[PDB]
Scaffold this active site. Sequence first.
Site, mmCIF file in Angstrom:
data_model
loop_
_atom_site.group_PDB
_atom_site.id
_atom_site.type_symbol
_atom_site.label_atom_id
_atom_site.label_comp_id
_atom_site.label_asym_id
_atom_site.label_seq_id
_atom_site.Cartn_x
_atom_site.Cartn_y
_atom_site.Cartn_z
ATOM 1 N N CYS A 159 -9.038 3.978 7.798
ATOM 2 C CA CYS A 159 -9.440 5.338 7.469
ATOM 3 C C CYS A 159 -10.500 5.317 6.381
ATOM 4 C CB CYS A 159 -8.248 6.139 6.966
ATOM 5 S SG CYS A 159 -6.886 6.384 8.143
ATOM 6 N N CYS A 215 -4.153 3.671 4.491
ATOM 7 C CA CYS A 215 -4.797 3.416 5.773
ATOM 8 C C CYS A 215 -6.198 2.813 5.585
ATOM 9 C CB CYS A 215 -4.866 4.731 6.576
ATOM 10 S SG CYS A 215 -5.867 4.632 8.095
#
Length: 119
Positions: free
Chosen positions: A43, A40
């Site tokens: 993230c 991700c």
Amino acid sequence: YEEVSVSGFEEFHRAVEQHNGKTIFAYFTGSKDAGGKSWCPDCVQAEPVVREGLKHISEGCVFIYCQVGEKPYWKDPNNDFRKNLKVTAVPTLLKYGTPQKLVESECLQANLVEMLFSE
């Protein structure tokens, strides 16, 4: 503030039960593999911003860092995070038990992050 790091829904649920009587902030992010690789991108970019915001948290609060799992697991529409907590995107910064939550690019804005940790 006290931080708690968990991986998976089971560990998360356990962590919240042990702090049932404290203000809880939870950060949902993708897991890093054994090699340390993250699936991700957003993230990775948002974590430093969220952690910088922790300097503004009010005393007596709890911060739960939660790795939700690998990509295939997150994509499963029946996973526990989606069905039980209504967390449908990562990264997500949530004030547990309340409506206040920041999602995706919102987690990259210091102003929004600060406002969530403030009160």
